[PDB]
């Protein structure tokens, strides 16, 4: 089923001197009210919550499902300086300062480090981005206009995508850094393209000769932008148009899945086309939206809250 999580952050020192104030008021642990308008979610975190609680309440079940022949998907949506990088990567070394991806890879390795020697596992990694409705490869700059097809069992995939092997989490972190060093980011570090990361974990039973394949999807959603209040010109305008249209299409797909409608518009955008296998049915997907409570950023906070609420 669909799970939508929202996280808030404590005000930084760089804005306390300007005298901003909290806008969000909490009720229980599942509702946040801004300007006397309730917003019901699945779970809301506060500033005092640590990373481990978020990981245990948002990622552990999906991480377990991947290693047992099933599939799952995790998104991440927010504006600049809203908590995206802290809740996703954070400090890549600290046992208490790591985000969600390092804990995911740590568990995905420490489970393999315990299942005897009668089982063999394989790990695959791919990293492709979506830019101007054209799929580019972050691990091979030669490829720039890859395509999407289907195999015999009509489960989509992207052909020509570079797919290397890994054996230790350090290699995973290194390839993550290399992939991030090729994305499109405007001038403080404003992302302008969606990113997709794939961890393929498959097991082959040496004795029983049974093969189980499981997939985990990591998606970093770019931020929707109200153009009229910014004054974008030229390429930035095209980027904003594409990002807004893609986010609207994804919202439509998720709403159609949640409401249990007969037809789900899986073929309205590239992003939903790729993730058709690990989105609906017996697939568990969790979405995390990060927001800032400072009154300086109330409008974008409301935009993020509305996008999260669209799923229901």
């Amino acid at each position: 089923n669909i799970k939508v999580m929202c996280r808030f952050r404590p005000l930084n020192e760089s804005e306390v001197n300007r005298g901003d104030k909290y806008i969000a008021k909490f009720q229980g642990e599942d509702t946040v009210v801004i300007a006397s308008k309730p917003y019901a979610f699945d779970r809301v975190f506060q500033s005092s919550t640590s990373q481990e609680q978020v990981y245990n309440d948002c990622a552990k079940k999906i991480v377990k499902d991947v290693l047992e022949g099933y599939n799952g998907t995790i998104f991440a949506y927010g504006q600049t300086s809203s908590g995206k990088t802290h809740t996703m990567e954070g400090k890549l070394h600290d046992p208490e300062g790591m985000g969600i991806i390092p804990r995911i890879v740590q568990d995905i390795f420490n489970y393999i480090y315990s299942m005897d020697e009668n089982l063999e596992f394989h790990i695959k990694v791919s990293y492709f981005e979506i830019y101007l409705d054209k799929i580019r490869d972050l691990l091979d700059v030669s490829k720039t206009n890859l395509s999407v097809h289907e195999d015999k069992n009509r489960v989509p995939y992207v052909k020509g995508c570079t797919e290397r092997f890994v054996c230790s989490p350090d290699e995973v972190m290194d390839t993550i850094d290399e992939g991030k060093s090729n994305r499109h980011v405007a001038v403080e570090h404003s992302s302008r393209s969606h990113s997709i990361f794939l961890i393929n974990v498959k097991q082959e039973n040496t004795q029983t000769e049974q093969k189980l394949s499981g997939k985990l999807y990591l998606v970093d959603l770019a931020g929707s932008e109200k153009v009229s209040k910014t004054g974008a010109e030229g390429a930035v305008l095209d980027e904003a148009k594409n990002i807004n249209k893609s986010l609207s299409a994804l919202g439509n797909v998720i709403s159609a899945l949640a409401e249990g409608s007969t037809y789900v518009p899986y073929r309205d955008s590239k992003m939903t086309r790729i993730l058709q296998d690990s989105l609906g049915g017996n697939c568990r997907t969790t979405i995390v939206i990060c927001c800032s409570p400072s009154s300086y950023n109330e409008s974008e906070t409301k935009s993020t809250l509305l996008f999260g609420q669209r799923a229901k």
Binding site: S228, K241, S248, L306
Partner: protein, 428 residues
């Protein structure tokens, strides 16, 4: 002096302006070429050689109708730089008229308006003509209104809009544009008059005995109403009233500023005789539910303030008698907190006929501007249409495809619901 700046944006506004300027040129005895063979400075400026240049700016994103104006029978009147034209129309998109295509001629029109405003001493207000539902009339108007509010601000602004009808309609995505523009019209405007096609169609059917109306008749009626409004600034008479007194008599609260207009007596040439057309009859007929230009019966509502603008041969004794007869009635109910709910204006200038027109030469006419609580039903119907169409999110990929977020629709819906709630709560 007393001057106004006219702006016509979109096809509907441009054609309304065509009719209005025809009427004004007829009223002041100015030939189309601008030579006449002092009660005219309000709408024109002298050039020193006998030519007169009207104070109007024509803006459109499509070169079709402005090209008709440039080559029609009024090509030698307007200033060539007043007529401003783009490349591609708004295509019924709020975003295309607002930002995507708007940010290419808005600076030019602002410069033209500044050039016109510098030339006028006693600026009185703006008279913007646009339409609700179209991309240009709903989106491009918002940008111009915001820029004018930022620049000028304190000057009064009046708008005349074509509102969507209950059943008769032309476009398919009209509710979205109407909701967005009616959100934008409450922050910057001061007194917006709204009309619709269906009520004028019925008015043409019954009173004028015409079964096949077109747009020209509607434009003529709207021009007549606007001329009736501006007559007090143009000419002289006992109990005259200008714009600021209009707004201080007709707008009780900062948000209740959405009146509806009415004209009387609309009659034909054959029915011009056989009727007295006295002051009492004219006054009584203007409160009928069948002569309102918005499809909303005043009986299911209570008035707040109605200002009557008599023009022609009028004597105040008859006006007082008519007001007493109106007050003693039972069908129309006033709010308890407004013991005096009538404003009276009289002028010495009778109406002017246009050649080849359906209107008749009468000795007197009135224009009642009233703001009752009955205007909420049209907004209710439009909101119902919007929510029914937006439940499935149809035609939304076009709007979000031009750099527009999904939150604007919900925000505008919330603002409209707040407006309806405020109107109803102040009604009781």
């Amino acid at each position: 002096m007393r001057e106004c700046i006219s702006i016509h944006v979109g096809q509907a506004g441009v054609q309304i302006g065509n009719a209005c300027w025809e009427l004004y040129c007829l009223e002041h005895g100015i030939q189309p070429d601008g030579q006449m063979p002092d009660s005219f400075n309000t709408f024109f400026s002298e050039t020193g050689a006998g030519k007169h240049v009207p104070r109007a700016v024509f803006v459109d994103l499509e070169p079709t109708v402005i090209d008709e104006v440039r080559t029609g029978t009024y090509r030698q009147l307007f200033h060539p730089e007043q007529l401003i034209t783009g490349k591609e129309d708004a295509a019924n998109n709020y975003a295309r008229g607002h930002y995507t295509i708007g940010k290419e001629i808005i600076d030019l029109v602002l410069d033209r308006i500044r050039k016109l405003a510098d030339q006028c001493t006693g600026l009185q207000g703006f008279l913007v003509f646009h339409s609700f539902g179209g991309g240009t009339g709903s989106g491009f108007t918002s940008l111009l209104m915001e820029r004018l509010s930022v620049d000028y601000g304190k000057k009064s602004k009046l708008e005349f809009s074509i509102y969507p009808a209950p059943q008769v309609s032309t476009a398919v995505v009209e509710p979205y544009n109407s909701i967005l523009t009616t959100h934008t019209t409450l922050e910057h405007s001061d007194c917006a008059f709204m009309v619709d096609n269906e009520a004028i169609y019925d008015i043409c059917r019954r009173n004028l005995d015409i079964e096949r109306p077109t747009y020209t008749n509607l434009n003529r009626l709207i021009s007549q109403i606007v001329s009736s409004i501006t007559a007090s600034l143009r000419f002289d008479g006992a109990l005259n009233v200008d714009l600021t007194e209009f707004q201080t008599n007709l707008v009780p609260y900062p948000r209740i500023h959405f009146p509806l207009a009415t004209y009387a007596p609309v009659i034909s040439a054959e029915k011009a005789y056989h009727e007295q057309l006295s002051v009492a009859e004219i006054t009584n007929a203007c409160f009928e539910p069948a002569n309102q230009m918005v499809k909303c019966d005043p009986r299911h509502g209570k008035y707040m303030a109605c200002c009557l603008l008599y023009r022609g041969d009028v004597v105040p004794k008859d006006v007082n008698a008519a007001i007493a007869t109106i007050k003693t009635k039972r069908s129309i109910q006033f709010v308890d907190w407004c013991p005096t709910g009538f404003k009276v204006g009289i002028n010495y200038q009778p109406p002017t006929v246009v050649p080849g027109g359906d209107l008749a030469k009468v000795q007197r006419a009135v224009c009642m501007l009233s703001n009752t609580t009955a205007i909420a039903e049209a907004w209710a119907r439009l909101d119902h249409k919007f929510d029914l169409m937006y439940a499935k999110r149809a035609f939304v990929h076009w709007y979000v495809g031009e750099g527009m977020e999904e939150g604007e629709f919900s925000e505008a819906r919330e603002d409209m619901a707040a407006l309806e709630k405020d109107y109803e709560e102040v009604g009781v």
